[PDB]
């Protein structure tokens, strides 16, 4: 179910579907890795849908920076 937050359509180009997904990152088991976007009220995106390389995803995860996804990072922030 999408209610657990993984098997969702995360963005207009999202390719992830529970019937066809396969592991891609070294840290994945049976669920896609995701990252939190701070735009608006916030939302989660699949890392692979953002075209994040593993090293980049891990660097983001180990740091304290907020993240803005590819759809929202270019929107001016008041």
């Amino acid at each position: 179910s999408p209610e657990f937050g993984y098997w969702i359509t995360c963005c207009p180009t999202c390719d992830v579907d529970i019937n066809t997904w396969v592991p891609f990152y070294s840290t994945e088991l049976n669920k896609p890795a995701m990252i939190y976007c701070s735009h608006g009220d916030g939302h989660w995106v699949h890392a692979q849908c953002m075209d994040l390389e593993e090293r980049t995803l891990i660097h983001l995860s180990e740091g304290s920076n907020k993240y803005y996804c590819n759809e929202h990072v270019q929107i001016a922030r008041a």
Binding site: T27, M34, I35, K66, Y67
Partner: peptide, 10 residues
């Protein structure tokens, strides 16, 4: 940044 499924676990 907050992430999910980014660490090895046991």
């Amino acid at each position: 940044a907050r992430t999910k499924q980014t660490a090895a676990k046991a």
